[PDB]
Design a binder for this molecule. Structure first.
Ligand SMILES: [Mg+2]
Length: 529
RNA sequence: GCUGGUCCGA
RNA sequence: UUGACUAGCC
RNA sequence: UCCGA
């Protein structure tokens, strides 16, 4: 009895034809939320992968778990546990469409909390448009009109003014489009002004409010909207700098000619929101606004390493990782990556995760480096082995008693250590992918060598394909031969529906890579909590 | 007063 | 933007 | 496709 044979009737064949278990639908939902389906996997094509997860979603709704789905989507969104928004928004769109009335109602109820910025709302609505044929249903019923109307009417006019000028339109939709389709009725004078600005433009608003009496709050909105117009009618460096300071305008408010100015950037740097700062490190370095040993460089490092703000702004470790890698590249533009910035990014990476108190148990961390793990993740340049290595570094730095190992169809030494800097672990890992997949190795190896481990964490895509015993079986053998209640945590690295964890074994757990809140689930499972 | 749906955006 | 239609609710 | 702590 080996992997090419089913262990029981509950097992199904994976992409290689070997037998594993079907991961639960709620668990597959989480994998989807964290990895999406873009780029598909080594075995499944993008489109097919998308349909598979969409199928699982519909199955959840059909099984009457639609409200649990929405709750899970909302939780991931609010806590920022997922690197990208597309998957959560696509899922919310499905739930808001054709689902049972309860599911649909919970979904729209979650719109304000899930769609925080215009880009989210625009993307959500576009997916509902794409789902319009496949789900045989229209989208502009009273519920969507109401949800969109509330999105605008429950917001402070001045804040909305910032939102509609910074994000005029994204992913196919503009605010004008939404107002036209929602037929919103402004809830106050500030909203009416903004609605008028979005629908007819500045000139219209100006003529509409001339000789008109306005509260002091409305006056603020008018002045702000005017500033966004004024900044586009001048090439004077100082006037722009003063408007930025005065109205806290951001990069999105400026013209191309303005972004060539080192001084405009320095003033832009003053109150640059966190994500924008992270993504423009390369640009500002090339322009010398982030000069070596400068005062800006030092300021930037302090912002990137402040755990409180990283959480507040919902900065995800994967964003940190991607930024780190491209910044280190030194080209995108050409620049000398600042070593202090590079060190701060490494530091922020770990801080971006939801940290927890250590358990003090013995962990054996095994990274799957088989050929399939060369698959790209989240449309980035980083493969699954690289991403999993980053997760291992996280766990290894949380649990002092951690041992890292690698494997394909044979055990291999791990070329990374707990003291390395992230960019270094990345370089040491993108040449390792090779060979077949034997997911039972870690447990078999530990037994053979008498290595004591309380927890086995295996980072893989669960596409095991060697004529060796089932990993579940290897785990059972380890428990008996070593006299240790070892547990296996399967850290999924894709959104396929396969798992080597035995559903009937309370000692085996399914979770997925780069869920910024995964360290919490691991701690609870480990401590039997 | 309210909430489901069809149409109306680009 | 500040709907049309339709189905229904208090 | 740039989440104002
Ligand atoms: Mg493989």
């Amino acid at each position: 009895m080996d992997q090419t044979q089913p262990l029981n009737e509950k097992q199904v064949p994976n992409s290689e034809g070997c037998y594993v278990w079907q991961v639960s639908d709620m668990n597959r939902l989480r994998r989807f939320l964290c990895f999406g389906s873009e780029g598909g996997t080594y075995y499944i094509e993008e489109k097919k992968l998308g349909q598979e997860n969409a199928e699982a979603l519909l199955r959840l709704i059909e099984d009457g778990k639609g409200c649990e789905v929405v709750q899970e989507i909302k939780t991931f969104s609010q806590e920022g546990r997922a690197a990208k928004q597309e998957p959560t928004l696509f899922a919310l769109a499905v739930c808001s469409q054709c689902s049972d009335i309860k599911t649909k109602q919970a979904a729209f109820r979650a719109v304000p909390e899930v769609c925080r910025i215009p880009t989210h709302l625009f993307t959500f609505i576009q997916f509902k448009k794409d789902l319009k044929e496949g789900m045989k249903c229209g989208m502009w019923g009273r519920a969507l009109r109401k949800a969109v109307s509330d999105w605008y009417n429950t917001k402070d006019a001045l804040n909305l003014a910032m939102a509609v000028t910074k994000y005029k339109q994204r992913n196919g939709w503009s605010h004008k489009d939404l107002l036209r389709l929602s037929h919103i009725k402004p809830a106050n004078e500030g909203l009416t002004m903004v609605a008028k600005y979005v629908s007819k433009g500045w000139k219209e608003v100006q003529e509409a409010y001339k000789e008109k009496e306005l509260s002091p709050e409305t006056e603020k909105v008018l002045k702000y909207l005017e500033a966004t117009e004024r900044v586009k009618r001048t090439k004077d460096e100082l006037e722009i700098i003063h408007l930025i300071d005065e109205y806290r305008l951001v990069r999105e408010h400026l013209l191309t000619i303005h972004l060539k100015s080192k001084e405009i950037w320095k003033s832009l740097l003053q109150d640059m929101p966190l994500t924008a700062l992270l993504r423009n490190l390369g640009k500002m370095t090339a322009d010398s606004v982030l000069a070596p040993a400068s005062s800006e460089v030092s300021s930037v490092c302090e912002r990137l390493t402040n755990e409180k703000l990283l959480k507040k702004a919902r900065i995800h470790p994967f964003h940190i990782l991607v930024a780190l890698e491209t910044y280190k590249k030194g080209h995108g533009l050409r620049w000398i990556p600042d070593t202090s910035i590079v060190e701060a990014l490494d530091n922020a990476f770990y801080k971006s995760f939801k940290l927890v108190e250590p358990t003090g148990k013995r962990f054996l961390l095994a990274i799957d480096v088989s050929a399939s793990m060369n698959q790209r993740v989240l449309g980035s340049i980083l493969n699954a082995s690289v991403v999993a290595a980053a997760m291992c570094m996280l766990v290894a730095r949380t649990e002092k008693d951690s041992h890292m190992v690698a494997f394909s169809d044979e055990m291999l030494p791990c070329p990374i250590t707990v003291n390395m800097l992230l960019h270094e672990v990345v370089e040491k890992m993108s040449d390792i992918t090779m060979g077949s997949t034997d997911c039972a190795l870690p447990m078999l190896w530990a037994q053979k060598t008498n290595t004591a481990a309380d927890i086995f964490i295996v980072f893989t895509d669960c596409e095991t394909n060697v004529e060796d015993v089932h990993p579940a079986t290897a785990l059972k053998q380890y428990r008996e031969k070593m006299g240790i209640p070892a547990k296996l945590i399967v850290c999924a690295m894709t959104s396929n529906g396969f798992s080597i964890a035995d559903p009937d074994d309370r000692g085996m757990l399914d979770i997925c890579g780069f869920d910024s809140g995964a360290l919490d689930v691991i701690r609870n499972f480990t401590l039997d909590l």
